[PDB]
Design a protein around this nucleic acid. Structure first.
Lengths: 49, 153, 121, 202, 116
RNA sequence: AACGCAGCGAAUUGCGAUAUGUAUUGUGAAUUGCAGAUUUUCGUGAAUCAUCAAAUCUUUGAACGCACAUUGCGCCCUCUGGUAUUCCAGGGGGCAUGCCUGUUUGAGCGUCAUU
RNA sequence: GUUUCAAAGGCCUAAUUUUCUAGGCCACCAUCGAAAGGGAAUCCGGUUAAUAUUCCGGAACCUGGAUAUGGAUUCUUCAC
RNA sequence: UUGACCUCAAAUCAGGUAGGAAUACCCGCUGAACUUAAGCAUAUCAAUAAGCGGAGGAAAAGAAACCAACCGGGAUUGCCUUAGUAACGGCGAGUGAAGCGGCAAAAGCUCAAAUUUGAAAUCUGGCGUCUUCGACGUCCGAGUUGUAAUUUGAAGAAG
């Protein structure tokens, strides 16, 4: 909202980096049952704070 | 301050109310001229300073090793008696000759009954100003009571 | 006897001899080394395609700077490491949460010549 | 034997000498604060019979507490229940005013440990008590074997749990046929005899 | 790369030069990291920075102990940690310190041995 | 509790600008999805190993200089810069509250002796 | 409850020219509360795929530090 | 004019100490109603849930101001019995112990109140030195309005 605080901007900085798809080289690991990232966020669908 | 207003009003509150005869007798204190002669006497027969006790114990250790003599060595001390529980026992057995009681003990209950005890046994006693001044002759801050028993001829 | 004369009707706290510290043992034992060093403040040189355009034209080199870094400290850090006299400093915090410091040098030192020395261009 | 004279003199409370001293002392304690530090014991005979010793470690504290009953704190006397529990004004507190006095000084002086309390004086609005304390961290109390036991970790807040002289009276812990429902423990005894004990072979 | 046992014998000034030289290598490799896909050389050099800082901190803390040895009262970090409850509780000198009346009681009538 | 750290990780698992760890001890050659070394491979030594007694430990929190929808605003000692006991910045060390034991300055015709 | 039936302090000049000591005056009192109230001082032209009263060019202004040149003032003086 | 004493203060004085967490069990305070009585008000659920304070590996209790009426037992704690009994209760519904007896385990003790009075004999801190959970020596302070030794009712003290 333009005039925002530093404590708020620090949380939104995380939300940028965490929101990204599953890297491919992890899927070739031994045992590994993971396929796609469950914890994923879109701005229209779900909100943060 | 509040502590100054307390002690000044505590002086007044005791005076305005009718005090009983048992508390009232401590106002009858020893006068200035007679008192000075008493403490001139009692500064003789005063106890040992800490250095003079160390002087005596070195003389004790010398004579015991080479001589072997206790009970007569380092003569017999003539000294003033002090401490409340210590002094009360001497008055109870008719041993004390003179007694000096303080006028400003914190609870009066401690020292109020001593005038009645000395009456029954027929012991000379005298209330005197300054619990501090009884302390000065006995290497103490405050003494409360100070009595005599033994004295030179 | 003979009271202390006093004009005022108030009574205040008389100031007393306030004594200083003089301890028998140190609480810390070992004094800690420099928290923020010259190398720790300025971390990386930024090599985006926009930054190359500023180095040639504007006479300004750009850095990725650590958080907890004043414009006094960044001016001292660049002066010590690369041996250059700095003109001005401008700083911003990126959206990802990392500080960026635009640094403009004086007319004596060329930004392009020092750029090829450090590594990138 | 000076203390024995005070032991007998204190009992004669309605005398001329003591009713004077009682009224002079009770005024002084009102002007001072609710909880405040006392320099020496007011009753020197009474203190040493409860384990007081004049040396570095032992401490005395005066304290004032309100008289009368406890009131039920519900607003406007609205209990919300059956007629049995509608009482408000005539209900009473289960611990004594000694225990209330002993606990308040414990919260102020947390580092100290409570040993005992004794009655000084009273009026219509208040009662007065003098709680004696012991410092466990001080090295005189730690080394000397007579007063070492108090320094142990099991004696942390004796006043709160009710392990003092007044506490064990209020709990009702005495040997006798009169004391069955509370003796070992009131809730402990209830928890024992309201329980179904079953073995492997019935 | 660097061994820890080699850094024990060195003086105070030698470790200070060693540390400054390692930081310059770390700075130069971070420039290479953005002009190259992969670079596992960066891992080994920053382990060596941690090795030197560990050796310097030991020599200082040893020197503080060396002067404080003998006397009462030392820094709280250098004292015995253990735990809170044991540290406040009584020592082995204390508790065992029993009164004078039960010294004479223990000597006179101790627990004697017997059979049958 | 927040925010960070892997050659390529978003989560989980570990750790704190010495950041998937450092030193110390034991075992004796791995780790492995793909790289890359290091040759350390008859060794004072591989390892996401076991072990664990020396250290590091961001910002917080009982949370402690005063505040805290603020990365807000001060004060003291100390070394280095800009001409500097007083102004500006930088590196380091400190300043909460109640209660106890002692130390040093004190307040009160509360009260004692001496000029 | 927030100035009370509290012993509630922080502001200036020398002394001393070790930089630590002396002068003094004055006194019912924390701290948070407004990105529309109060409030020290910046404008024009240019430039980016996406930023600007914040970068570049050119012209100003305030607050806090230091300080010396010119001018003014001075035989009765702090201007006519 | 100078120095004491008693009460009360101040300091970023020297050195210490208290808070929060977890809460199965343990020690206290506080305290309901649904329900049962075929209704409902004493009663019952219950001296219980929720709420508040405080501990430890255990806690509490404990060396008789006891139980008995026998040819008398002998600190506390728990298990088997006593007993669904003696009592309580709109004597309705319902509630309800303890002594002896047999076992598991057993351990006893300390202050105050007397004068060392031919010697405050006692203790904290400071400074120094050692074999450093301490010991020895020395200097102020605490304290005679009572710190050591001596004695605790089973006794015990002075000759």
């Amino acid at each position: 909202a333009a005039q925002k605080s530093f404590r708020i901007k620090q949380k939104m900085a995380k939300a940028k980096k965490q929101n990204r798809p599953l890297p491919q080289w992890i899927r070739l690991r031994t045992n590994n049952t993971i396929r796609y990232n469950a914890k994923r966020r879109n701005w229209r669908r779900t909100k943060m704070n | 301050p509040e502590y100054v207003r307390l002690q000044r009003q505590k002086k007044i509150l005791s005076i305005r109310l009718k005090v009983p005869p048992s508390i009232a007798q401590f106002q009858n204190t020893l006068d200035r001229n007679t008192a000075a002669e008493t403490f001139k006497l009692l500064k003789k027969y005063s106890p040992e300073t800490a250095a003079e006790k160390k002087e005596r114990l070195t003389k004790e250790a010398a004579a015991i090793a080479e001589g072997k003599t206790k009970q007569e060595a380092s003569p017999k001390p003539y000294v003033v008696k002090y401490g409340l529980n210590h002094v009360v026992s001497l008055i109870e057995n008719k041993k004390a000759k003179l007694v000096l009681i303080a006028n400003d003990v914190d609870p009066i209950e401690l020292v109020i009954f001593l005038p009645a005890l000395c009456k029954k046994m027929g012991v000379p006693y005298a209330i005197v100003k300054g619990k501090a001044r009884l302390g000065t002759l006995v290497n103490q801050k405050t003494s409360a009571v100070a009595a005599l028993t033994e004295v030179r001829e | 006897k003979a009271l202390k004369v006093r004009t005022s009707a108030s009574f205040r706290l008389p100031k007393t001899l306030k004594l200083a510290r003089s301890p028998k043992y140190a609480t810390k034992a070992v004094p800690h080394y420099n928290r923020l060093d010259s190398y720790k403040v300025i971390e990386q040189p930024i090599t985006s395609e926009t930054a190359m355009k500023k180095v040639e034209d504007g006479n300004t080199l750009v850095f990725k700077v650590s958080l907890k870094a004043n414009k006094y400290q960044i001016k001292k850090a660049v002066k010590e490491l690369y041996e250059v006299d700095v003109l001005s400093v401008n700083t911003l915090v990126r959206p990802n949460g990392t500080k960026k410091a635009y640094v403009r040098l004086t007319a004596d030192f060329d930004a392009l010549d020092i750029a090829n020395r450090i590594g990138y261009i | 034997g000076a203390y024995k004279y005070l032991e007998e003199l204190q009992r004669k409370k309605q005398s001329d000498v003591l009713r004077f001293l009682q009224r002079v002392r009770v005024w002084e304690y009102r002007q001072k604060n609710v909880i405040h530090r006392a320099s020496r014991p007011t009753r020197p005979d009474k203190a040493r019979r409860l384990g007081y010793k004049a040396k570095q470690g032992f401490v005395i504290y005066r304290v004032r507490v309100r008289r009368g009953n406890r009131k039920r704190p519900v607003s406007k006397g609205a209990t919300y229940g059956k007629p049995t529990n509608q009482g408000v004004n005539q209900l009473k507190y289960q611990r004594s005013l000694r225990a209330t006095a002993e606990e308040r000084v414990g919260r102020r002086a947390a580092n100290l440990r409570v040993l005992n309390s004794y009655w000084i004086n009273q009026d219509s609005t208040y009662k007065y008590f003098e709680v004696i304390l012991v410092d466990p961290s001080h090295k005189a109390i730690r080394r000397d074997a007579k007063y070492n036991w108090i320094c142990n970790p099991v004696h942390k807040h004796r006043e709160a749990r009710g392990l003092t002289a007044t506490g064990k009276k209020s709990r009702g812990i005495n040997k006798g046929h009169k004391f069955h429902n509370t003796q070992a423990g009131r809730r402990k005894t209830w928890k024992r005899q309201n329980t179904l004990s079953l073995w492997r072979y019935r | 790369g660097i061994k820890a046992y080699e850094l024990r014998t060195k003086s105070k000034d030698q470790l200070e030069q060693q540390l400054v030289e390692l930081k310059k290598e770390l700075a130069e490799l971070k420039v290479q990291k953005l002009s190259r896909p992969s670079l596992p050389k960066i891992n080994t050099v920053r382990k060596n920075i941690a090795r030197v800082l560990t050796v310097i901190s030991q020599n200082q803390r040893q020197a503080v102990r060396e002067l404080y040895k003998g006397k009462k009262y030392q820094p709280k970090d250098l004292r015995a940690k253990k735990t809170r409850a044991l540290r406040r509780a009584l020592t082995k000198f204390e508790a065992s310190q029993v009164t004078e009346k039960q010294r004479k009681k223990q000597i006179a009538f101790p627990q004697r041995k017997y059979a049958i």
